[PDB]
């Protein structure tokens, strides 16, 4: 048996909801190492939030975090957790929980074994399909499609039905400040074949169970 | 995935093709196609590309289940063709179109017969009938510029450098063959035994090998081995997202041991690493091939120009 | 009055070259120092610990070195795997577990200038009330761009979002998109949208732009 710190699925809720998220650690003695958590903000680095020691539940925390969060074990089911009383939009992040491995008296340990991260995303909008609209032309040309406000992720975006893959760019999409998601996804095309082949963009919206063809044109 | 360039995204269909010398530059055009659509101009009078936004990795195969295209570096007939290693002649109304493969809207399909290679093309604006006998007007071909399933290549085929053998090794190897299928009357229209009664020119799957001389070596026991043999057209040179190297770079790349490359470079051929001033410079490394591949036939050991298993036209004796 | 410094913040270096990423410690943190490797879309894994110690199952072209406040982590010859973020972190003085900032190990090209385009806001989403114009910068190289949206001559902070892909697996550009948004009514007391784009590969800004209800 191999260390492993499995963790709990993605999560979405509103702000001021609570949360608790949990990781399950195996194949070692769970009470003898301490646990800690860290988050990682959505193209950021990482920062250190707290650790628990599952054998006393004595717990340590960032100056950061220190009374934001609140850590826990449960060393009947080997599993430490993270919890939040309130969450705000800016909770939105990957949580890391990773075991601490110390040795000797002169430091405080480093993570050598990490969880597979939990995804937590806080909107107060609810489940809503995305308007798509043209991005119309205008060698070669760009064209494309604005798949806009919907939540929450994933779309899926293909042009002619898979037929056209090579030259495509589908951005990451951005969580707006009104709590719904927006991308674009775009394509280079022989200017000569605006107006005599068809570009026609399928977004996928699981979730909503939408599907949307949007053809694309010039003027 | 492709040799070294990703699949083309041509503009218009009036751009020209050039000539380029160096090995690299070549094994670019093979992986965008450009080969295909330079056979197509020259045969066809067809206007622009096949193998838009696909390249080669996307060609149509039959069978579809192709072993050798899955190892890019493995050359088609096509692909030896551009290298100057054989040619695919343009097909005759005497040349055998074979049952099988999905022709309908195909504008080139390509397969092996008993003494060459043969194409069968497609002009501007035309793609071949379901039997593939005809080319009929096709508006989905009207820009040019056509995607590579397009593109028909029928066998299961790698094509490499050759060792020649004398012609008496070719004779006895012949011999071999006939011994093999004593039933086979003709291949592709030419006398593999002499027959009188003959059946109808039936479809015919057969493993071969092309060892440079008349016709093929058709096969039923054999042994193959791969061996990668690291010579200098097991490499090719480029530089990170910017396609291939010049033909002069190259040479300094396979000669000097001063270039960057992969493992399997260094290990042969040398290689230098860091530092530089500014920009990246050339980089080799292995293509990606099982190997060079030794046939084992008639008591025989034997590097082929092209060996395959592919589907070709014979008539049988009656009696 | 504790730091870790890492430089630089992105490395652009070539496949089988050898990479070379430095932390510095405001103070010295002896040989507490750990670094991790974060590859695209996984969580970070331990690569060094005790400045210099290898993990277990780690590849051996991985090293680290150092004691004090300057450490380095030296990948030997740099494989396709390696491209990926490395972050350094403290573990020798309270408040423990200071994570370095990153540092980017992206693949080397030259450099190549983006294709600008500006795209209007379609009728059906000026029905919908809002306007959304959108910039795209496509297949460039290095990452750094500067978009700046001017409204009529006005430049625009606030209502606009920049998105970025990955670096491309066939030819290592980036594209990126630029999103600015305002309600209808904002949108038709204006006349001249424009994009205005600098790039290391081009030999001055350029200007994509339009006139609202006009070609
Ligand atoms: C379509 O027609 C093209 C024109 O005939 C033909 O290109 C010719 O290809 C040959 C063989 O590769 C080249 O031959 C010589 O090129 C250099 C000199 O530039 C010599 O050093 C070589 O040793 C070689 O003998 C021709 O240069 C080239 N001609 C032109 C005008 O490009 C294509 O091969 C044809 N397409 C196909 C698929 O066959
Ligand atoms: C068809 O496309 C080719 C390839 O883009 C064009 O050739 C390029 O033309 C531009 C100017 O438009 C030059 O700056 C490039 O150096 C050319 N590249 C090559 C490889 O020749 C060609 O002009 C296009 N044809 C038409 C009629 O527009």
């Known amino acids: 048996s191999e260390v492993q710190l499995v963790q709990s699925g993605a999560e979405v809720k509103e702000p001021r909801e609570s949360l608790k998220i949990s990781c399950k650690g195996s194949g070692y003695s769970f009470t003898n190492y301490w646990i800690g958590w860290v988050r990682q903000m959505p193209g950021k680095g990482l920062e250190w939030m707290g650790i628990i020691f599952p054998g006393d539940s004595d717990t340590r925390y960032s100056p950061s975090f220190q009374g934001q969060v609140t850590i826990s074990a449960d060393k009947s089911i080997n599993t430490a957790y993270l919890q939040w009383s309130s969450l705000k939009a800016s909770d939105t992040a990957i949580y890391y929980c990773?075991?601490?491995?110390?040795?000797?008296?002169?430091?405080?340990?480093?993570?050598?074994?990490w969880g597979q991260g939990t995804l937590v995303t806080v909107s107060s909008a609810s489940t809503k399909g995305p308007s798509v609209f043209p991005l119309a032309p205008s060698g070669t040309a760009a064209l494309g499609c604005l798949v806009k406000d919907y939540f929450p992720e994933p779309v899926t975006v293909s042009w002619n039905s898979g037929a056209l893959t090579s030259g495509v760019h589908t951005f990451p999409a951005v969580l707006q400040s009104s709590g719904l998601y927006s991308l674009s996804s775009v394509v280079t095309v022989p200017s000569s074949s605006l107006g005599t082949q068809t570009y026609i963009c399928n977004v996928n919206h699981k979730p909503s169970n939408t599907k949307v063809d949007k053809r694309v044109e010039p003027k | 995935g492709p040799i070294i360039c990703a699949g083309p995204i041509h503009s218009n269909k009036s751009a020209d093709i050039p000539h380029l010398l160096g090995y690299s530059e070549k094994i670019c055009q093979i992986d965008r196609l450009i080969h295909v659509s330079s056979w197509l101009r020259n045969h066809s009078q067809f206007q622009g590309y096949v193998g838009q936004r696909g390249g080669r990795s996307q060609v149509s195969y039959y069978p579809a289940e192709n072993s050798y295209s899955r190892w890019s570096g493995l050359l088609s007939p096509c692909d030896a063709d551009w290298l100057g290693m054989l040619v695919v002649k343009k097909a005759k109304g005497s040349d055998m179109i074979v049952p099988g493969p999905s022709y309908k809207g195909k504008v080139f399909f390509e397969r092996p017969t008993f003494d060459g290679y043969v194409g069968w093309g497609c002009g501007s604006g035309k793609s071949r009938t379901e039997s593939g006998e005809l080319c009929s007007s096709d508006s989905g071909t009207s820009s040019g510029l056509l995607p590579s399933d397009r593109v028909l290549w029928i066998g299961d085929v790698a094509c490499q450098p050759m060792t020649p053998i004398p012609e008496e090794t070719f004779l006895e190897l012949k011999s071999f063959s006939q011994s093999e299928f004593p039933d086979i009357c003709k291949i592709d229209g030419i006398v593999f035994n002499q027959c009188e009664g003959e059946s109808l020119p039936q479809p015919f799957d057969v493993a071969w090998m092309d060892v440079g001389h008349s016709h093929k070596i058709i096969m039923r026991e054999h042994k193959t081995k791969w061996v990668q043999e690291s010579s200098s057209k097991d490499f090719v040179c480029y530089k990170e997202g910017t396609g291939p190297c010049s033909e002069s770079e190259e040479k300094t790349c396979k000669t000097s041991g001063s270039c960057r490359g992969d493992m399997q470079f260094c290990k042969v051929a040398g290689c230098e690493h860091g530092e530089e001033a500014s920009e990246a410079k050339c980089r080799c490394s292995l293509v990606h091939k099982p190997g060079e591949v030794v046939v084992s036939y008639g008591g025989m050991r034997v590097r082929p120009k092209c060996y395959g298993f592919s589907r070709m036209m014979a008539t049988l004796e009656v009696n | 009055e504790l730091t870790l410094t890492q430089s630089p913040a992105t490395l652009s270096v070539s496949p089988g070259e050898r990479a070379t990423l430095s932390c510095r410690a405001s103070?010295?943190?002896?040989?507490?120092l750990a670094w991790y490797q974060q590859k695209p879309g996984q969580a970070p894994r331990l690569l060094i610990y005790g400045a210099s110690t290898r993990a277990t199952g780690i590849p051996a072209r991985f090293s680290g070195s150092g004691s004090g406040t300057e450490f380095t982590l030296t990948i030997s010859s740099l494989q396709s795997e390696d491209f990926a973020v490395y972050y350094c972190?403290?573990?020798?003085?309270?408040?423990?577990?200071?994570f370095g900032q990153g540092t980017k190990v992206e693949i080397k090209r030259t450099v190549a200038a983006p294709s600008v385009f500006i795209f209007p806001p379609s009728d059906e989403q000026l029905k919908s009330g809002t306007a959304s114009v959108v910039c795209l910068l496509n297949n460039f190289y290095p990452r750094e761009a500067k978009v700046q949206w001017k409204v009529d001559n006005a430049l625009q902070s606030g209502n606009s979002q920049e998105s970025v892909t990955e670096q491309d697996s066939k030819d290592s550009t980036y594209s990126l998109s630029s999103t600015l948004t305002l309600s209808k009514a904002d949108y038709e007391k204006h006349k001249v949208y424009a994009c205005e784009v600098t790039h290391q590969g081009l030999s001055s800004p350029v200007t994509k732009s339009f006139n609202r209800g006009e070609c």
């Open positions: 103070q010295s943190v002896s040989s507490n």
């Open positions: 990773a075991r601490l491995k110390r040795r000797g008296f002169s430091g405080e340990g480093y993570f050598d074994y």
């Open positions: 972190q403290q573990y020798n003085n309270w408040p423990p577990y200071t």
